[PDB]
Amino acid sequence: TTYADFIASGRTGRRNAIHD
Amino acid sequence: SVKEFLAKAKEDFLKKWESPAQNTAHLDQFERIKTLGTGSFGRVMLVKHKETGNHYAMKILDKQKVVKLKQIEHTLNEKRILQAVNFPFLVKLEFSFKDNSNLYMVMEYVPGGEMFSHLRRIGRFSEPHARFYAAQIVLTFEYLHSLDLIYRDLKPENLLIDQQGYIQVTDFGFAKRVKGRTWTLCGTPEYLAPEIILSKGYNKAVDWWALGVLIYEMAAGYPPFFADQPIQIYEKIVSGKVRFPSHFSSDLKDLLRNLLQVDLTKRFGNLKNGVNDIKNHKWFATTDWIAIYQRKVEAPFIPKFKGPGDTSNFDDYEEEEIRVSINEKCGKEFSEF
Ligand SMILES: COc1cccc(CC(=O)N/N=C/c2ccc(O)cc2)c1
Numbered sequence: 001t002t003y004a005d006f007i008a009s010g011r012t013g014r015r016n017a018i019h020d
Numbered sequence: 021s022v023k024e025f026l027a028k029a030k031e032d033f034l035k036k037w038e039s040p041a042q043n044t045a046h047l048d049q050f051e052r053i054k055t056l057g058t059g060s061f062g063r064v065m066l067v068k069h070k071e072t073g074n075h076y077a078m079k080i081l082d083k084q085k086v087v088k089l090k091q092i093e094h095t096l097n098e099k100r101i102l103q104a105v106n107f108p109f110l111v112k113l114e115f116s117f118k119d120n121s122n123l124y125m126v127m128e129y130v131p132g133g134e135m136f137s138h139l140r141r142i143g144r145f146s147e148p149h150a151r152f153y154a155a156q157i158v159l160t161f162e163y164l165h166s167l168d169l170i171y172r173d174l175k176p177e178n179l180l181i182d183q184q185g186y187i188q189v190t191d192f193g194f195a196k197r198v199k200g201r202t203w204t205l206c207g208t209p210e211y212l213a214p215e216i217i218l219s220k221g222y223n224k225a226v227d228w229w230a231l232g233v234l235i236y237e238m239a240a241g242y243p244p245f246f247a248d249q250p251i252q253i254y255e256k257i258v259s260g261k262v263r264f265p266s267h268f269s270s271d272l273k274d275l276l277r278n279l280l281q282v283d284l285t286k287r288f289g290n291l292k293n294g295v296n297d298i299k300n301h302k303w304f305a306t307t308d309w310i311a312i313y314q315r316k317v318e319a320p321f322i323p324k325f326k327g328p329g330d331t332s333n334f335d336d337y338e339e340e341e342i343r344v345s346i347n348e349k350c351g352k353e354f355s356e357f
Contacts, residue, residue: 002265003143006242014136014177015208017060017193018250019089 026166029106033167036104037197042357045115045126047344050078053329055337057134059191061085061095062122063340066129066331075329076114079125080342083350086123091193092353094206098192099125099357107163108315109156111180111188118357120345130188132181132323133333139176144241147269149320151304153179154235155312156187158304161231162295165224168199174230175208176237181333185319198223209250210243214282217254228289228298232279239272240265244280258282271303 006012050067057064061081068075086095102113102125115126135153139145145153157174164171172194180188194206201221213229215222236244244263245256260282264273278297281287288297299309311317323333 002263003241006246009246010248011210011246012140015175015210017173017208018206018212019060019091019094020205 022162026163029163030167032106033104037100040100040356041103041116043117045117045124047117047119047124047342050076050126052078052342054331055339056331056334058337059193060089061091063337066329067126068329075129076126077111077129079127081123081125083118083121083123083354087350087353092350094193094196095123096354096356097194097196099123101169101195101197102127102192105164105167105169107160108313109160109187109189110163111190116357118354120348122342122344123354123357127190128188130180130182130190131325131330131333132183132185134177135179135181135187136176137333137335138181138321139238139241145238146320147239147272147303148306150235150238151307152312152317152320153187153238154231155304155307155309157189157231157234158295158298159309159313160189161224161227161289164195165227165295168197170196170198170202170224171227172196172207172230173211174227174234175211176234177208181321181323183323183325184315185322186315209253210237210245212254212257214258214260215284217258225284225287225290228279228287229281231289231298232276232281235272235279236262236264236276239268244276269303271301271305275301275303 049070051070053066053068055063055065056077064077064079066075067078086092099116111130112128113125117124173191178191180190182188196202201223203221205216207216211230211233213226216226233243245253247253262280278288284290289295291297326332
């Protein structure tokens with residue numbers, strides 16, 4: 001499932017800003 | 021009237037924009053209690069104002085780190101714009117000041133924690149729940165955009181929940197006053213509009229795109245474009261192909277197709293009728309815009325409050341001593357702060 005794919009991903013924590 | 025109120029808002033804003041508040045407190049006036057969140061240049065701590073007993077959130081930026089990341093002008097923007105604005109769903113700046121090492125922005129403490137926290141824990145929000153939050157962001161963006169401000173960092177990490185369940189927008193680090201077009205590549209990968217990524221020059225329509233990303237993330241529990249690396253995210257965004265959960269209502273999908281629209285002649289919020297295309301969309305048919313503004317709508321979610329300085333709705337962070345140099349750093353660079 002897409003949900004499962006997101007939860008196994010590395011970007012479920014706080015996301016940093018990109019300055020450039 | 022919306023017209024009347026905004027015109028009044030703009031006069032208020034412009035006086036403060038042209039004559040910003042500066043040096044309105046000192047570090048020693050505050051008792052530092054605990055870190056509430058962190059960021060590239062520093063941290064924000066719960067503090068208590070010694071002469072009043074009032075709690076606030078104090079954002080502490082290391083001048084040398086700002087300089088290293090070539091964020092001087094953005095930081096100046098952040099503080100000049102935040103001290104000038106006033107809207108029920110914007111975090112209020114109460115004091116600002118600087119010392120040899122750091123810049124300080126003392127803001128209202130919003131005790132319910134980050135929307136991010138609640139969204140990740142609960143999984144996803146119901147459509148009425150997402151809609152209640154989305155309405156506040158729509159009004160806030162009407163307000164900011166009327167002042168020629170672009171926000172450029174919408175995401176649940178930056179939306180705090182107040183004691184009554186209403187949203188407070190925080191972190192104005194990428195906010196900018198611009199008439200027309202700008203080009204900086206800034207934001208958060210999952211929330212970037214395609215025209216930012218393709219270096220096209222962009223305008224306030226990027227905030228409406230990001231609203232689409234946020235509503236999707238709120239209602240699905242995951243963003244419409246994710247991957248393990250930003251480069252793959254960007255590829256997905258520019259592709260622009262969006263798939264929706266089977267539980268998304270028809271009206272929600274239609275709204276999002278119009279917000280997550282690569283074509284700027286078709287993207288909602290950016291047409292002749294501007295924000296009214298969004299406010300009058302069917303998904304918002306049950307929303308009382310004036311009552312959202314007046315905070316008369318019952319929140320779907322009220323945070324736990326065990327007492328005035330309580331931080332249980334925030335994650336714990338490693339603490340560090342706030343060392344202030346005996347030599348002034350970067351004085352010229354931050355002279356107008
Ligand atoms: C790029 O360097 C940074 C350094 C520190 C923080 C941040 C991000 C930020 O502004 N958070 N604010 C949280 C906040 C929390 C509670 C509250 O009542 C008001 C604001 C960025």
